[PDB]
Structure formats: C-alpha cells, structure tokens
Amino acid sequence: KPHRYRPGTVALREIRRYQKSTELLIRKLPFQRLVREIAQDFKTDLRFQSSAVMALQEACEAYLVGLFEDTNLCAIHAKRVTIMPKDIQLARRIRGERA
C-alpha cells in the first residue's frame, strides 16, 4: 500500500526539474578543490579569482550536459534507454575529442 512511482517516472521528473533551471549542479567546494588539485600539476602555489573558478565550473557543467545529450542519442541509436560508457566514447570519437 505505500505509494511508489514506477521506475522512470521520478527520473523523467528530475529531467524536467533540471532543464527548467540554471543552478550549477556540482557542489561548489568539491569543484573548487579539484580545480586546485589539477592546477598544482602545472604550477605550484597558484591563487584563483573566484570568478575564474566559477567560469571553469560554468564551462565544465555546460560541456558535460552537452556531452550527455550526445551520449543519450548514441544510447537511443542502439535501441536503448540506458547511457553506457561506449555511448560516451562514441560521442567523443565523432566529436573528434578522442582518437
């Protein structure tokens, strides 16, 4: 008797929720650390303007959201509904990001 939504229905609901919005979807501090981690590998003791870290995050999430759209088309192309890493790898190969 307790209410339960069939699988797909809360997912479809999330899609709508997030397509309506523009908030960044990666949590800010984790992101900010990762950037600095990665930045060490090229130069030591670098500071960032916070707008520089926001500009990167804006740019990343935009690229990933974009890549997911192409990944979803590749998944559907093969008569599926479930994105899998070969979808991502195909998208990026056709995109020419990858060999």
């Binding site: 797909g8 229905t9 479809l12 899609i15 709508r16 397509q19 309506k20 919005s21 523009t22 500009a55 804006e58 740019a59 935009a62 959201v65 979803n72 088309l73 559907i76 509904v81």
Partner: protein
C-alpha cells in the same frame, strides 16, 4: 568653431562609432581604416544587439519578469534558428538548456 556632434548622432546610431573606430585602429586588423567602416560595424553591432533583446525581452515577459537575465537570453537564442547558428559554439553562463526530452523516453500513455 562649429558644435560637436557625435558620429553616432550623424549615423542615427546608439552604438559608439568613435569607440569602434578606435578599437579597429588599435586592434591590429589593418594599417588604415576608412570612415565608413566603424559606422557600418557599429550599425551591425546595434542591429544584432537589438534583435537579441527583442527576443530576450519577450522571454522575460513570458516568465512574468521585468528584467532580462541570462536564461531569457538563452531561450531567445536557442529557439531562434539563426541566432543559434551564429552562437552555436558559445556557452551562455547561467542559461541552462531548452526543455527537450526525446519521445522514446516518455510513457506509452
């Protein structure tokens, strides 16, 4: 001496012809710059600017908002066939995406 009229005012333009003209001379595009150029360029910059704000404004109205914000610009651009092409490799911060859910992913009812 005669009175100062701006070149924008002479062109019936809101964009700064004089500034554009200086940006052209100072941006390493050519040794020389004709006086028609910045007038024409500032013109096009004004047209496209107006075009986007026409469409961005309508989206702010549909959203019951007095002020244009990035999402309104993004909706304006991504629903207009030509503006989208013009800006097809451009990311608009804080814009989000157009609502799109492939048909196959919807319920059968």
């Amino acid at each position: 001496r005669a009175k100062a009229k701006t070149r924008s005012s002479r062109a019936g333009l809101q964009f700064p012809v004089g500034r554009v003209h200086r940006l052209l001379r100072k941006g390493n595009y050519s040794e020389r710059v004709g006086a028609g150029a910045p007038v024409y360029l500032a013109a096009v910059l004004e047209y496209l600017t107006a075009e986007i704000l026409e469409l961005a404004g309508n989206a702010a109205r549909d959203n019951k908002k007095t002020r244009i914000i990035p999402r309104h610009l993004q909706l304006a651009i991504r629903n207009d066939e030509e503006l989208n092409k013009l800006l097809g490799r451009v990311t608009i911060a804080q814009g989000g995406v157009l609502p799109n859910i492939q048909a196959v992913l919807l319920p059968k009812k």
